[PDB]
């Protein structure tokens, strides 16, 4: 997260950190006791034994409850940057309570409204190209950018109906490498997307791009 501030305990009861080969890798959202939502690009084709999830902590390295993975299912139309969502099944079930809870999802068919406020969270880099990652969770609030303006930035074909955009035109606030797969929520803390891609991090006139939960709800509901 670039331009962010520290999250507090219980801000995102459903957030998980995803390590790979013992190092930081991605974020995700806990949907139920044995199911995590993340970005397909975080997991597709990699050895599943390399991943560990941690729930219930602000720290990616300590605290909370950990689990290995039992299975990985990517969206059937994942291709390039499009449809960038995956469902992970956990070997160890994670009960709700305390600072752990399960995500509330955007309604099927919904699309975030331009100019509304969204909050994104993760343990990724705090500058583009940054090598050091924070131990504790950061968050930032940015407005939704209309799909039309996002298409003016990236190209008409680059931004699909299963993506939405968020950022500030002058830059300085964004998700970045290591944030992929983690949550973006609306102002009610409903899960509207997962961190997916963008041109660098926090650049003027290049919004962050997010996979849309509202658009991909049928996939989630089938396999969660």
Swiss-Prot record:
The active site is at 41 (charge relay system), 84 (charge relay system), 180 (charge relay system). SUPFAM superfamilies: Trypsin-like serine proteases. Coiled coil: none annotated. It comes from the Eukaryota. One of its GO terms (cellular component) is extracellular region. InterPro entries: Peptidase_S1, Peptidase_S1_PA, Peptidase_S1_PA_chymotrypsin, Peptidase_S1A, Trypsin_dom, TRYPSIN_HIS, TRYPSIN_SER. It holds the Pfam family Trypsin. The keyword Secreted applies. Residues 1-224 form the Peptidase S1 domain. Disulfide bonds join 26-42, 150-165, 176-201. It is an enzyme of class 3 (hydrolase). GO terms for molecular function: serine-type endopeptidase activity. It catalyses: Preferential cleavage: Arg-|-Xaa, Lys-|-Xaa. GO terms for biological process: proteolysis. Keywords: Disulfide bond, Hydrolase, Protease, Secreted, Serine protease, Signal, Zymogen. The record marks 174 as: Required for specificity. Its EC number is 3.4.21.4. It is found in: Secreted. PANTHER family: FI18310P1-RELATED, POLYSERASE-RELATED. Belongs to the peptidase S1 family. This is Trypsin. It comes from Fusarium oxysporum (Fusarium vascular wilt). The lineage of its organism: Eukaryota, Fungi, Dikarya, Ascomycota, Pezizomycotina.
């Amino acid at each position: 997260i670039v331009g962010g501030t520290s999250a507090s305990a219980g801000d995102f009861p459903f957030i998980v950190s995803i390590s790979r080969n013992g190092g930081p890798w991605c974020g995700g959202s806990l949907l139920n006791a044995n199911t995590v939502l993340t970005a397909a690009h975080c997991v597709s084709g990699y050895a599943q034994s390399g991943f560990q999830i941690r729930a219930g902590s602000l720290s990616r390295t300590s605290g909370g409850i950990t689990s290995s993975l039992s299975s990985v299912r990517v969206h059937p139309s994942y291709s390039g940057n499009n449809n960038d969502l995956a469902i992970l099944k956990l070997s160890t079930s994670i009960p709700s309570g305390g600072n752990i809870g399960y995500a509330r999802l955007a309604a099927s068919g919904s699309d975030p409204v331009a100019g509304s406020s969204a909050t994104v969270a993760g343990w990724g880099a705090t500058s583009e190209g940054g090598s050091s990652t924070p131990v504790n969770l950061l968050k930032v609030t940015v407005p939704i950018v209309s799909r039309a303006t996002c298409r003016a930035q990236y190209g008409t074909s680059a931004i699909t109906n299963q993506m939405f955009c968020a950022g500030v035109s002058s830059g300085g606030k964004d998700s970045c490498q290591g944030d992929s797969g983690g949550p973006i929520v609306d102002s009610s803390n409903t899960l509207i997307g997962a961190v997916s891609w963008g041109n660098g991090c926090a650049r003027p006139n290049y919004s962050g791009v997010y996979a849309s939960v509202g658009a991909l709800r049928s996939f989630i509901d089938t396999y969660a």
